[PDB]
Design a protein around this motif. Structure first.
Motif, PDB file in Angstrom:
ATOM      1  N   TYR A  69      -3.564   8.073 -64.895  1.00  0.00           N
ATOM      2  CA  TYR A  69      -4.864   8.096 -65.339  1.00  0.00           C
ATOM      3  C   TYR A  69      -5.717   6.976 -65.127  1.00  0.00           C
ATOM      4  CZ  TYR A  69      -8.547   9.820 -68.634  1.00  0.00           C
ATOM      5  N   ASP A 115      -6.691   5.677 -61.727  1.00  0.00           N
ATOM      6  CA  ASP A 115      -7.603   6.764 -61.264  1.00  0.00           C
ATOM      7  C   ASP A 115      -8.885   6.445 -62.000  1.00  0.00           C
ATOM      8  OD1 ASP A 115      -6.094   7.842 -59.076  1.00  0.00           O
ATOM      9  OD2 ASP A 115      -6.035   9.874 -60.056  1.00  0.00           O
ATOM     10  N   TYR A 116      -8.832   6.070 -63.285  1.00  0.00           N
ATOM     11  CA  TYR A 116     -10.292   5.984 -63.772  1.00  0.00           C
ATOM     12  C   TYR A 116     -10.634   4.517 -63.214  1.00  0.00           C
ATOM     13  CZ  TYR A 116     -13.884   5.505 -67.026  1.00  0.00           C
ATOM     14  OH  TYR A 116     -15.188   5.359 -67.770  1.00  0.00           O
ATOM     15  N   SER A 117     -10.010   3.667 -62.896  1.00  0.00           N
ATOM     16  CA  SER A 117     -10.382   2.209 -62.364  1.00  0.00           C
ATOM     17  C   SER A 117     -10.982   2.810 -60.989  1.00  0.00           C
ATOM     18  CB  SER A 117      -9.296   1.280 -62.297  1.00  0.00           C
ATOM     19  OG  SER A 117      -9.048   0.961 -63.571  1.00  0.00           O
ATOM     20  N   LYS A 118     -10.317   3.536 -60.333  1.00  0.00           N
ATOM     21  CA  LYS A 118     -10.983   3.586 -58.795  1.00  0.00           C
ATOM     22  C   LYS A 118     -12.341   4.570 -58.908  1.00  0.00           C
ATOM     23  CE  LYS A 118      -7.792   4.110 -55.396  1.00  0.00           C
ATOM     24  NZ  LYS A 118      -6.424   4.918 -54.921  1.00  0.00           N
ATOM     25  N   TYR A 119     -12.401   5.491 -59.934  1.00  0.00           N
ATOM     26  CA  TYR A 119     -13.744   6.093 -60.307  1.00  0.00           C
ATOM     27  C   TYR A 119     -14.711   4.839 -60.509  1.00  0.00           C
ATOM     28  CZ  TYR A 119     -17.477   8.125 -62.900  1.00  0.00           C
ATOM     29  OH  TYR A 119     -18.649   8.538 -63.138  1.00  0.00           O
ATOM     30  N   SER A 135     -15.741   3.429 -57.675  1.00  0.00           N
ATOM     31  CA  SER A 135     -16.296   4.285 -56.926  1.00  0.00           C
ATOM     32  C   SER A 135     -17.933   4.243 -57.273  1.00  0.00           C
ATOM     33  CB  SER A 135     -15.946   5.673 -56.663  1.00  0.00           C
ATOM     34  OG  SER A 135     -16.865   6.377 -55.933  1.00  0.00           O
ATOM     35  N   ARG A 136     -18.075   4.143 -58.585  1.00  0.00           N
ATOM     36  CA  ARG A 136     -19.470   4.082 -59.221  1.00  0.00           C
ATOM     37  C   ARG A 136     -20.134   2.632 -58.735  1.00  0.00           C
ATOM     38  NH1 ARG A 136     -21.506   7.055 -63.257  1.00  0.00           N
ATOM     39  NH2 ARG A 136     -22.605   5.262 -64.214  1.00  0.00           N
ATOM     40  N   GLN A 144     -21.123   2.958 -54.943  1.00  0.00           N
ATOM     41  CA  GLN A 144     -22.198   3.576 -54.794  1.00  0.00           C
ATOM     42  C   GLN A 144     -23.518   3.046 -55.041  1.00  0.00           C
ATOM     43  OE1 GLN A 144     -20.376   7.016 -54.840  1.00  0.00           O
ATOM     44  NE2 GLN A 144     -21.841   6.720 -52.961  1.00  0.00           N
TER      45      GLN A 144
END
Length: 24
Positions: free
Chosen positions: A2, A5-9, A12-13, A16
């Protein structure tokens, strides 16, 4: 997973934001 993946999110932000800066 979790956590990783939150870190990858967050990454990604950021990437972006960077894409938008590159076009600005």
């Amino acid at each position: 997973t979790y956590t990783s993946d939150y870190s990858k999110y967050l990454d990604s932000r950021r990437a972006q934001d960077y894409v938008q800066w590159l076009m600005n």
